[PDB]
Amino acid sequence: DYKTFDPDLWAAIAKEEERQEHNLELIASENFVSEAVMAAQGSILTNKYAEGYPGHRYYGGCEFVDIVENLAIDRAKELFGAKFANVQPHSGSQANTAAYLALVEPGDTILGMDLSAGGHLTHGSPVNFSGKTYHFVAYGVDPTTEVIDYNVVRILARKHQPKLIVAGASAYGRTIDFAKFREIADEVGAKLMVDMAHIAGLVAAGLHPNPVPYADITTTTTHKTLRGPRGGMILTNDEALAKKINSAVFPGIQGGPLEHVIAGKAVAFKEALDPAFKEYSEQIIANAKAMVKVFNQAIGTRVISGATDNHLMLIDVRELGINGKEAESILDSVNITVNKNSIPFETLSPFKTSGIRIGTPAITTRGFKEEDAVKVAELVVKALQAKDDNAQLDEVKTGVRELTEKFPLH
Amino acid sequence: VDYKTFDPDLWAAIAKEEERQEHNLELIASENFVSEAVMAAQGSILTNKYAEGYPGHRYYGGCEFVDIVENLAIDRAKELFGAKFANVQPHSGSQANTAAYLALVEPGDTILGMDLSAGGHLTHGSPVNFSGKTYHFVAYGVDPTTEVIDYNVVRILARKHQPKLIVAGASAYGRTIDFAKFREIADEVGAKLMVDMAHIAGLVAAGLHPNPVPYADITTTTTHKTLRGPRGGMILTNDEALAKKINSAVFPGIQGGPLEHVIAGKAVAFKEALDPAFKEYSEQIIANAKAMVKVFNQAIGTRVISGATDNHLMLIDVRELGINGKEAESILDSVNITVNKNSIPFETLSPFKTSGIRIGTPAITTRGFKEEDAVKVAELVVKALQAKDDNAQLDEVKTGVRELTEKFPLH
Numbered sequence: 063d064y065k066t067f068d069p070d071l072w073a074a075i076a077k078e079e080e081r082q083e084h085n086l087e088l089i090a091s092e093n094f095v096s097e098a099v100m101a102a103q104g105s106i107l108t109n110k111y112a113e114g115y116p117g118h119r120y121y122g123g124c125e126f127v128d129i130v131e132n133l134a135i136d137r138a139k140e141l142f143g144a145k146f147a148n149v150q151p152h153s154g155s156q157a158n159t160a161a162y163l164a165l166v167e168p169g170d171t172i173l174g175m176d177l178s179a180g181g182h183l184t185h186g187s188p189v190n191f192s193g194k195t196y197h198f199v200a201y202g203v204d205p206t207t208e209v210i211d212y213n214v215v216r217i218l219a220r221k222h223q224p225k226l227i228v229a230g231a232s233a234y235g236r237t238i239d240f241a242k243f244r245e246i247a248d249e250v251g252a253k254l255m256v257d258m259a260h261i262a263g264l265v266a267a268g269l270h271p272n273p274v275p276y277a278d279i280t281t282t283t284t285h286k287t288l289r290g291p292r293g294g295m296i297l298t299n300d301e302a303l304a305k306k307i308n309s310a311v312f313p314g315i316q317g318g319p320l321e322h323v324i325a326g327k328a329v330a331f332k333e334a335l336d337p338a339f340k341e342y343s344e345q346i347i348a349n350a351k352a353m354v355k356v357f358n359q360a361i362g363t364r365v366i367s368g369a370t371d372n373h374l375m376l377i378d379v380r381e382l383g384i385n386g387k388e389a390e391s392i393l394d395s396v397n398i399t400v401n402k403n404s405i406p407f408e409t410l411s412p413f414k415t416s417g418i419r420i421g422t423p424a425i426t427t428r429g430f431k432e433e434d435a436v437k438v439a440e441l442v443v444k445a446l447q448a449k450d451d452n453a454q455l456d457e458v459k460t461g462v463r464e465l466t467e468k469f470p471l472h
Numbered sequence: 473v474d475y476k477t478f479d480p481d482l483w484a485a486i487a488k489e490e491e492r493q494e495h496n497l498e499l500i501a502s503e504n505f506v507s508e509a510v511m512a513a514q515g516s517i518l519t520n521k522y523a524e525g526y527p528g529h530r531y532y533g534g535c536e537f538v539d540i541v542e543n544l545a546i547d548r549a550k551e552l553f554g555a556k557f558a559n560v561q562p563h564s565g566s567q568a569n570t571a572a573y574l575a576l577v578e579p580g581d582t583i584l585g586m587d588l589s590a591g592g593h594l595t596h597g598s599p600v601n602f603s604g605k606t607y608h609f610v611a612y613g614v615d616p617t618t619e620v621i622d623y624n625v626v627r628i629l630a631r632k633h634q635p636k637l638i639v640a641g642a643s644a645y646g647r648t649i650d651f652a653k654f655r656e657i658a659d660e661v662g663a664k665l666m667v668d669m670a671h672i673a674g675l676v677a678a679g680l681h682p683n684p685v686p687y688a689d690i691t692t693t694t695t696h697k698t699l700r701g702p703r704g705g706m707i708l709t710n711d712e713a714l715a716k717k718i719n720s721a722v723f724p725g726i727q728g729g730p731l732e733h734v735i736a737g738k739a740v741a742f743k744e745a746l747d748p749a750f751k752e753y754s755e756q757i758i759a760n761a762k763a764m765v766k767v768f769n770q771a772i773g774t775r776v777i778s779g780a781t782d783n784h785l786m787l788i789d790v791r792e793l794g795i796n797g798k799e800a801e802s803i804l805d806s807v808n809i810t811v812n813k814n815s816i817p818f819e820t821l822s823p824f825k826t827s828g829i830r831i832g833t834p835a836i837t838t839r840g841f842k843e844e845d846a847v848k849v850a851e852l853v854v855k856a857l858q859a860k861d862d863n864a865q866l867d868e869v870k871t872g873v874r875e876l877t878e879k880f881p882l883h
């Protein structure tokens with residue numbers, strides 16, 4: 063009805079609904095939120111200005127909005143065991159901005175994971191506030207094993223004497239050893255920040271070591287393996303840092319929080335407290351390992367580091383005569399969505415790349431089991447091996463159609 | 473329903489907030505009621521899409537239709553305001569202002585901006601905010617007697633401090649802002665000009681406030697105040713070199729993935745603002761505000777800062793009544809009238825006690841209040857603040873509030 067007033071906009075949204083139904087979303091950072099999360103974001107909480115924190119707002123009328131924000135704070139403390147939580151960051155980027163503000167001064171030396179090795183842009187990129195505002199020195203992975211070499215990180219720390227070490231990654235498929243990062247931080251007098259955005263759901267399910275007891279500050283997004291709305295979060299066990307975090311978020315770098323999004327965070331956090339969430343997260347990892355077993359035994363799809371401990375994998379496609387941008391293009395043509403992704407010691411442009419990144423949280427949410435993940439990896443292999451044999455790309459398109467129809471959305 | 477039974481804590485709180493919005497007079501000047509369509513866009517499956525980059529230049533695929541949506545927001549914004557370029561990704565007004573500064577000045581540069589007590593925003597140079605921490609802000613205010621901007625003082629300050637940038641725009645300023653004078657003062661000292669129209673954006677879009685876009689190097693705004701859209705920010709410019717710096721500052725500069733369900737809501741609201749009926753709404757906003765200022769000027773104890781309004785809001789110095797702004801806020805909230813305490817020009821109390829309250833009409837106007845209803849609101853406010861404890865009076869106000877909200881239901 064209101065769609066009559068703006069048919070162009072609602073038409074685009076309908077096509078996007080259909081695109082999400084008909085494609086296999088293998089983007090490691092995406093998911094499908096519940097009906098309840100979307101209803102919270104579609105609520106009248108968008109109308110409320112609520113600057114400040116629960117019980118000490120700068121506006122009238124927040125007495126019931128404060129319940130929502132307290133639910134999100136307290137469910138985060140329950141899920142992750144943090145003594146303090148801040149649920150107002152608009153995004154992972156704002157969450158990391160405020161975490162740095164609470165820990166270091168502009169120009170300070172910070173050790174963070176290199177982008178090609180799998181770090182995030184906010185872990186030290188020169189085109190990002192992180193690299194522009196602080197002096198970042200990168201660590202990476204070993205060139206042969208493609209996992210983090212903790213003794214190399216240790217050497218780097220003692221050489222550079224950073225005020226802060228950042229751990230966490232956008233494209234690292236192996237377990238991060240937070241105990242060792244804390245060990246190294248302590249040796250050089252540095253604080254430790256962990257960005258668990260990608261693994262937060264796995265951490266909540268007890269399937270990846272929990273960084274919260276080790277890190278001075280833990281940041282996260284709410285929309286990856288946690289399966290919540292797009293937004294950020296900051297955790298800490300230190301009451302003094304909690305006060306600095308809160309001031310840094312507001313009035314430091316934000317104004318009004320998005321209380322409708324925060325309600326969706328509260329919704330998603332109770333979903334994650336349900337025993338069914340542990341089974342979901344278990345299935346994410348099983349599906350991912352199943353998929354890595356297929357790629358390991360295929361010709362020309364080299365799995366970075368040869369294994370996965372979590373939800374994602376990086377695939378080196380150099381053996382196939384293509385770069386990551388071309389691989390992403392082939393797979394889109396058959397309704398399989400991935401992203402081109404730099405690989406350790408990447409030699410091509412960050413917009414060409416030698417690889418693609420694949421993750422299983424979204425298809426697992428659709429209901430894929432181990433057998434279905436194997437099928438996806440085989441269609442991916444077939445499409446990249448089909449050096450443009452139209453007959454084969456069309457078989458793959460059919461295999462995708464078969465899978466989406468067996469696992470429709472709500 | 474089924475998910476409301478899974479989580480009664482959360483859904484019963486939202487239900488109570490729906491009732492509060494129905495039953496209170498929402499007089500907070502920066503609030504509004506978005507349409508059903510805006511809420512449905514924010515509640516859409518667009519929340520599931522990562523779309524880093526810009527339309528047609530994304531960092532990965534899958535963005536065919538997200539690109540249509542965001543280009544609708546960009547194009548309707550350009551149409552609404554007459555700008556050659558728009559960025560609709562900023563998560564908020566604060567992020568919009570962060571990126572605008574990054575496109576205009578370097579850390580440590582001298583910036584002229586409105587003082588907080590005088591009506592400026594925290595991002596206009598407060599030392600507790602990134603703006604005051606990152607740049608050298610020099611504040612201008614209003615005149616103590618007339619409580620309006622003194623443009624020769626701004627000129628004097630600009631000539632004395634040689635700012636790299638002058639910022640114009642306010643959060644609690646009820647009078648017309650002369651953007652031409654600001655453009656002239658900036659040119660005289662060679663400064664750039666940035667205008668934050670967050671509060672007056674809808675009025676500009678309706679032609680009822682002078683338009684800053686032709687005078688400002690960069691114009692920033694929120695989408696959720698008089699523009700009546702979802703919570704978010706936006707940046708406008710006519711300069712292609714600046715537009716590139718703006719886009720780079722927003723992403724990958726200070727943000728990651730945009731909120732595309734919110735950006736859909738921005739597209740929905742921009743088309744609503746392009747409709748001729750938006751001009752009548754915007755006119756009614758100002759006529760309601762002016763009708764309230766008249767009531768407050770007659771009452772002793774509710775002193776209207778500067779004695780008039782040209783836009784949607786007014787600031788009330790309540791000290792003659794023997795209370796501060798915090799007590800007035802709390803008195804009004806206990807009779808179901810929602811305002812915010814607010815510093816006034818030359819504030820002498822703590823910024824958390826304050827001498828005043830701020831009142832605006834966009835929300836009640838959206839509910840359908842006309843001038844005679846705005847008059848009744850102002851009378852109830854006067855009565856509540858003069859009542860001094862008298863519960864008969866306060867309950868009288870409470871009945872008036874329920875009369876007005878029952879006359880003008882939501883949806």
Ligand SMILES: Cc1n[nH]c2c1[C@](c1cc(C#CCCCO)cc(CO)c1)(C(C)C)C(C#N)=C(N)O2
Nearest residue numbers: 177180181182183189232233402403404412413531
């Ligand atoms: C976004 C993003 N944010 N954080 C990230 C990314 C990734 C990314 C970065 C860039 C870049 C660049 C230079 C700056 C632009 O001027 C290009 C691409 C694809 O073209 C992908 C993907 C999305 C995960 C990535 C990688 N590879 C890593 N590790 O982390």
Ligand SMILES: Cc1n[nH]c2c1[C@](c1cc(C#CCCCO)cc(CO)c1)(C(C)C)C(C#N)=C(N)O2
Nearest residue numbers: 113120588591592593594643644813814815823824
């Ligand atoms: C938020 C906000 N952001 N921008 C703003 C505000 C206002 C505001 C600020 C503070 C503060 C502080 C630290 C001050 C340095 O010590 C306290 C209050 C009421 O308690 C209200 C209101 C909401 C409009 C305001 C005022 N008055 C101005 N003009 O603009």
Ligand SMILES: Cc1ncc(COP(=O)(O)O)c(CN[C@@H](CO)C(=O)O)c1O
Nearest residue numbers: 091153154155182231232257259728729
């Ligand atoms: C570890 C980490 N920390 C922070 C962020 C940023 O979150 P934001 O997009 O909400 O700003 C990301 C985003 N990660 C995106 C790229 O932006 C991805 O596809 O992986 C992240 O991976």
Ligand SMILES: Cc1ncc(COP(=O)(O)O)c(CN[C@@H](CO)C(=O)O)c1O
Nearest residue numbers: 317318502564565566593642643670671
């Ligand atoms: C002129 C201007 N520019 C920017 C902002 C910040 O927008 P944000 O709250 O979305 O971050 C505001 C917010 N205005 C709020 C105070 O934060 C208010 O109640 O008025 C603003 O008034």
